[model samples]
Target: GGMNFGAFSINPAMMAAAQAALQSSWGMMGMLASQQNQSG
Candidate 1:
């Protein structure tokens, strides 16, 4: 259950950033969970 903004200007280390952003689905979910826990 995830989605990405497709390929970007990934050169040398840009791949890492792009991949990290792409794989940030879990991170975003974590943020939502964390926010819910902190707020409630």
Candidate 2:
């Protein structure tokens, strides 16, 4: 949850895109967490 791309440009549309990307990435991170929890 603490990833970054170092300070980049942002706009209204880009902000929207970033939010979508975060949601999508959060889903992926949750999936990975589930797998890791089950593997041990």
Candidate 3:
């Protein structure tokens, strides 16, 4: 006799946290670029 099993999982909390971090980083970079352009 034999048996098999399969399973899947997702981590919404981690995914959301990572996405938020990336967005904040990009926003900071965009602000810096804008300031530099205005200064020049």
Candidate 4:
């Protein structure tokens, strides 16, 4: 599940899954950063 640049193309379904993963990953990273800010 991923995207491609240049002449490559990714299937739409895989792109959607990749997008979901990126959204959740950034959400988790933001939560961790918030916790760090609270503690530090």
Candidate 5:
């Protein structure tokens, strides 16, 4: 048996937005951890 593939597409603006959001989420977590360490 054989399988067929279809074209995949992505928007550059959305891709960048997703990456920025992910980075922001990690940044917030790191910031919180740093604050906790400083308070301790």
Candidate 6:
């Protein structure tokens, strides 16, 4: 799902933005996992 940046736009900027978004989601996942671990 995070690997479809090229499909969003051929422009370098758009692709970069897409990549940033994917990273942000990954960060969120990490945060959530950390939170769960802390709670447990």
Identify the leading candidate in terms of lDDT: 2
- Find the number of clashing residue pairs for candidate 2: 0
Which parts of model 2 have CA positions greater than 4 angstroms off? 27-40
Arranged by TM-score with the best first, the candidates are 2, 4, 6, 5, 3, 1
Model 2 TM-score relative to the real fold: 0.29
What is the lDDT for 36 in model 1? 38
lDDT of 6: 0.53
Highest TM-score: which candidate? 2
| Model 6 clashing residue pairs (backbone) | none
On a 0 to 1 TM-score scale, where does candidate 5 land against the true structure? 0.26
Clashing residue pairs for model 5: none
TM-score, each model?
0.24, 0.29, 0.26, 0.27, 0.26, 0.27
lDDT (Cα, tens digit) per residue for candidate 6, span 1-40: 4335454425575577668777676443332333334443
lDDT of 1 by residue, 1-40 (tens): 2444767664565456667766674543343333334453
- The runs of at least 3 residues in candidate 6 whose Cα sits more than 4 Å from the true structure, single-residue gaps closed, are 1-14, 26-40
Candidate 5: misplaced stretches above 4 Å? 1-14, 26-40
Better of 2 and 6 by TM-score: 2
Report per-prediction Cα RMSD to one decimal.
Answer: 9.6, 7.2, 18.0, 9.8, 15.4, 9.2
Taking the tens digit of each residue's C-alpha lDDT, what string does model 4 give over 1-40?
1434577655785478877877676433322333334444
Better of 1 and 3 by lDDT: 3
By the lDDT metric, which is better: model 1 or model 6?
6
Relative to the true structure, how large is the alpha-carbon lDDT of every model?
A: 0.53, 0.60, 0.54, 0.56, 0.55, 0.53
Between prediction 5 and prediction 6, the one with superior lDDT is 5
Per-residue lDDT for 1-40 in model 3, tens only?
1223666466686588668777675333322333334443
> What does candidate 1 score on TM?
0.24
